[PDB]
Amino acid sequence: KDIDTLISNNALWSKMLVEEDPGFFEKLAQAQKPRFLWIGCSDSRVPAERLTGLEPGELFVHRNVANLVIHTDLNCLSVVQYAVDVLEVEHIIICGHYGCGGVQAAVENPELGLINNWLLHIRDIWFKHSSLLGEMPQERRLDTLCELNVMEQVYNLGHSTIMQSAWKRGQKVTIHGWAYGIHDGLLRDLDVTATNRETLEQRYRHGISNLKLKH
Amino acid sequence: KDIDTLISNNALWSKMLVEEDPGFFEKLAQAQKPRFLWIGCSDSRVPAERLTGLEPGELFVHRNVANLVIHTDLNCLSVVQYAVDVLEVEHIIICGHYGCGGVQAAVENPELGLINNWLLHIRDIWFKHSSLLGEMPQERRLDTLCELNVMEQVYNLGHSTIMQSAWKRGQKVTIHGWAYGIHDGLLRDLDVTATNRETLEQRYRHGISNLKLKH
Amino acid sequence: KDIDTLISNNALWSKMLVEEDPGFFEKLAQAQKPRFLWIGCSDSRVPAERLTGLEPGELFVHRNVANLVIHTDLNCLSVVQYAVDVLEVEHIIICGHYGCGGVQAAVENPELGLINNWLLHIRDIWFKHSSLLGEMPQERRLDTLCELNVMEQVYNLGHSTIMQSAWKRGQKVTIHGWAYGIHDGLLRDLDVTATNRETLEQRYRHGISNLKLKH
Amino acid sequence: KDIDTLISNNALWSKMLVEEDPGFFEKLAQAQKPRFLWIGCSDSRVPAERLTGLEPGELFVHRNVANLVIHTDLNCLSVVQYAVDVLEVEHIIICGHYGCGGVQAAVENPELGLINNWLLHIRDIWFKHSSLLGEMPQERRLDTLCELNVMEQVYNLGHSTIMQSAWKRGQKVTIHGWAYGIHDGLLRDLDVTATNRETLEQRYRHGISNLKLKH
Ligand SMILES: [Zn+2]
Ligand SMILES: [Zn+2]
Ligand SMILES: [Zn+2]
Ligand SMILES: [Zn+2]
């Protein structure tokens, strides 16, 4: 697959929509405000459209390395704020994945250059849950660190002024923390779903509980 | 489409892969370093996998509002640096789209809150090409502003220390500026493709030329 | 001057305040909300307290390389927002300086590494005012580029959602663009002072006018 | 103190340098690369020149709200990188202060708007040292949280790719964590001084030890 290839395939794909689905065109222009925001990893091993079944333009998308929501990341925050305040998305989904190359680089910690700074946000979390991970077998640790990372970005997100003020306003917005692996492509809801500031706290704690309970 | 729905569809989608394509699983785990980085808009009216035909994990993805590459955006830059220096992607693609909601909000300029700051980076460009746009008909202006925005983010990207140092190192990396609309889903190469620092300049100018030539 | 030196001098400085000015202590604790925000360059060849005469804690301070106010710089913006919305500063001052090492590095353009990305925000401005600079003698260009940079950060600042919403709210806040050199330490008001959205535009244009008028 | 006032005082201050210190001018132009970087709080209750005794232009300065060094803060990082790689500063100093308005707002947690996001980086630390603070009296907690914040930004800073790569290169750079209050203006070295990656770890731990030892 080189460039002339994708250009060629595009043209033909576009022609053949006429016989497969012309309305694919017309579903998009009518309406189409998306109802969901998806925050994912740039690894994007499986595309959210395919995972979920959603048509495109029911979705609004942010993808950074390891699907982080840093407190002061104006890029990601700008996506969220537009999504919540302007497109009035009903749900937001942070999806991680087992085998995440950036979760991995945080842990193994090679000298990769500029990215290592971004990954320090992951090592912070790994530290934060040291004890928890200590009490479980090493085989299960990396993947648990994926689940913890999602869960923490869910926590971060509900703490943003954007979400705080939206919930207090009476806007109906729910946050989710999912993960999947490429062994099956099967979603695992991490149980951190947050419909307000109270449930954000409860369910943050609940889910950390269930990792510290099961292990 | 509510949440229980996507969870349900996911499970069934995942089961049915066994009969449609079990290898979908095994193509991913072997290898799979992606060869392409895609920078797009969070609007994501058409997913890059579908536009292009690429399998997932031939792609690495960044999506922000109006597919900007701001000089000092550590989020987007962190994606690029990992992509170029660590995954050694061969190509990078910045894809815009006609009807881009954020290109639109820059122009019409409503009070949307936090996002307006991000969109100031677009109004800067619109100003920069005032004369050029002045010499063409108003019907063609918004869409031309999409093309200009892509083209400028291509210019920005080749100016990043990351790209500058990669090209000087002898790494083989090419930048593209595409756009598409949902009228047909058909890609338009904007002709700004840059294989080094010399071609970045030539083709930046070349493409601005062809807008100022055709109009 | 090594470390033991500053620690030693500090102790003695602190003791000797008793005889020079004990109230220096008590002016600070009462009140002291500052009335001015100062955005400067990290070069800080002359400290704002000394330039201006202000007591400390009449001032609130941000210093980055070449005193930029980037649209999406959450650090600088966070300073401004707290200053304007919480401390209710009455004035904000962006001060540049002739001989600014970072204005210089933008122009001469050496490979310095990470910083070069930040300085691209300066080369953008230098481009924006190419014609203007072209019509004047080269001897006067670098220093004029300092004045232009200040002036543009003043323009940027009044365009921030923070300032836009503050002015529309009825809050009384004025923006200034100053510069000085170390030949005399003498301030030059660049005439871009902005008490609202209307005066921001007028005086942006006014001052660019006077550079394009005088030259 | 209004604007005409500072302009007037400036002019007169500048004239009167001739009789107080004309060389103040000529010390600056010769050389003057600074040997120290100072990272402080925008509160800037006491200016570093006065605290320390340093002449201006022995210093290079960054001031944000509560003197944070966030992993992904390109503004602050850009200052550090230029300072360390280009000006070859020998020392870097992070100075906090007791009574810090932003440390305070993190704790009390009022709805101040945009700034609250920046302050989440402080509440993270406060959490991180919950136990430690729990074992001491409440009267001593806020001020201890200042010391912890400095100490953590010192830790963050030595973890930046910039510092990591500089130390490994053989560059001679030392990090300090100081604090002061306006009761006396007296510096307290927090004992986190780091001359390399090994001493960064030792002394991070050492200093946390001495808070957990003394209390
Ligand atoms: Zn990943
Ligand atoms: Zn768009
Ligand atoms: Zn400077
Ligand atoms: Zn403070």
The C-alpha angle A102, A107, A112, rounded to 5 degrees, equals 55
Q: Are A133 and A197 in contact (CB under 8 A)?
A: no
- Gap between the Cα atoms of B76 and B78, Å rounded: 5
- Set of chain C residues whose Cβ sits within 8 Å of the Cβ of D13: 50-51, 53, 185
- Gap between the Cα atoms of C46 and D14, Å rounded: 11
- Set of chain C residues whose Cβ sits within 8 Å of the Cβ of D113: 81, 85-86
Which of B64, B69, B71 to probe by mutation at the C interface, max C CB count within 10 Å?
B71
Report CA(A110)–ligand 4 centroid distance (Å).
36
Q: Which residues contact B170 (CB under 8 A, 6 or more apart)?
A: none
- Gap between the Cα atoms of B65 and A78, Å rounded: 8
Residue A18, Cβ neighbours under 10 Å: how many?
Answer: 11
Q: Are B10 and A51 in contact (CB under 8 A)?
A: yes
Q: Which residues contact C7 (CB under 8 A, 6 or more apart)?
A: D187, D189
The token duo for C200 is 């921001």
Tell me which fold the domain C1-215 belongs to: Beta-carbonic Anhydrase; Chain A (3.40.1050)
The token duo for D4 is 């005409």
Q: Is the peptide bond before A83 cis (omega within 30 degrees of 0)?
A: no
Taking the CA atoms of C201, C206, C207 and C213 in sequence, report the sign of the dihedral they define: positive
Q: Which residues contact A134 (CB under 8 A, 6 or more apart)?
A: none
D176 is catalytic: no
Is residue D91 left, alpha or beta, with left meaning phi > 0 and alpha meaning psi from -120 to 50? beta
CA distances to A75, C197, C207 from C181, in Å? 36, 30, 19
Residue B177, Cβ neighbours under 10 Å: how many?
Answer: 30
Which amino acid appears at position A16 of this protein? M
A186 → closest Cβ in B11, B45, B82: B11
Q: How far apart are the first and last CA of chain A?
A: 45
CA distances to A37, C7, C41, C146, D57 from C178, in Å? 44, 34, 12, 10, 20
Q: Are C61 and C40 in contact (CB under 8 A)?
A: yes
Q: How far apart are the first and last CA of chain D?
A: 45
B95 is catalytic: no
Residues in chain D, how many?
215
CA distance A78 to chain C (A): 9
Give phi and psi for A171, each to the nearest 5. -65, 145
Residue C165, Cβ neighbours under 10 Å: how many?
Answer: 17
Report CA(A63)–ligand 1 centroid distance (Å).
10
CA B1 to chain centroid: 28
Beta strands in chain A (DSSP E): 36-41, 59-64, 91-97, 174-180, 188-189
D116 → closest Cβ in A114, A120, A161: A161
Which of C117, C121, C165 to probe by mutation at the B interface, max B CB count within 10 Å?
C117
Q: Are A95 and A180 in contact (CB under 8 A)?
A: yes
Is residue A175 classed as helix, strand or coil in its secondary structure? strand
- Gap between the Cα atoms of D38 and D153, Å rounded: 13
Residue of chain B whose alpha carbon sits nearest to that of D76: B72
Q: Which ligand is nearest to the CA of A41?
A: 1
Q: According to the entry, how was the structure determined? A: X-ray
Q: At what angle do helices D141-159 and D197-214 cross, to 10 degrees?
A: 170
Closest alpha carbon to C81 in C7, C160, C143: C160
Residue corresponding to tokens 């009035």: A88
Give phi and psi for D202, each to the nearest 5. -60, -50
In sequence order, the β-bridge partners of residue A41 are A64
- Gap between the Cα atoms of D125 and D144, Å rounded: 11
Q: Are D189 and C7 in contact (CB under 8 A)?
A: yes
Instruction: Check B72 against D72: CB less than 8 A apart.
Output: no
Q: At what angle do helices B161-169 and C115-128 cross, to 10 degrees?
A: 110
The token duo for B181 is 């609309």
Residue A180, Cβ neighbours under 10 Å: how many?
Answer: 20
Instruction: Check B164 against C118: CB less than 8 A apart.
Output: no
- Gap between the Cα atoms of B33 and B20, Å rounded: 24
Beta strands in D44-189 (DSSP E): 59-64, 91-97, 174-180, 188-189
- Gap between the Cα atoms of D12 and D14, Å rounded: 5
For chain A, how big is the Rg over CA atoms in Å? 19
Strand (E) or helix (H) holding A9:
helix A3-20
Residue corresponding to tokens 């982080």: A68
Burial class (CB in 10 A: 0-12, 13-18, 19+), D82: buried
> For chain A, which residues make up each domain, given as ranges?
1-215
Question: Which residue of the set D45, D63, D123, D188 is catalytic?
Answer: D45
- Gap between the Cα atoms of D175 and B175, Å rounded: 40
- Gap between the Cα atoms of B6 and B8, Å rounded: 5
Which amino acid appears at position C190 of this protein? L
- Gap between the Cα atoms of C178 and C173, Å rounded: 16
Which amino acid appears at position A90 of this protein? E
Which ranges of chain D would DSSP assign to H, the alpha helix? 3-20, 23-29, 48-52, 74-85, 101-108, 115-128, 130-134, 141-159, 161-169, 197-214
In sequence order, the β-bridge partners of residue C188 are C179
For chain D, how big is the Rg over CA atoms in Å? 19
Pairing relationship of beta strands A59-64 and A36-41 according to DSSP bridges: parallel
CA D71 to chain centroid: 15
- Gap between the Cα atoms of C201 and D131, Å rounded: 53
Identify residues whose C-beta is under 5 A from ligand 3, the ion: C 41, 43, 100-101
Q: Are B158 and B70 in contact (CB under 8 A)?
A: no
The token duo for C75 is 């650090």
CA distance B44 to chain D (A): 26
Is residue A179 classed as helix, strand or coil in its secondary structure? strand
Torsion of CA C156, C162, C168, C172, to 10 degrees: -90
Instruction: Check A65 against B57: CB less than 8 A apart.
Output: no
Q: Are C45 and C182 in contact (CB under 8 A)?
A: yes
Question: Which residue of the set D62, D95, D97, D176 is catalytic?
Answer: D97
Resolution of this model in Å is: 2.7
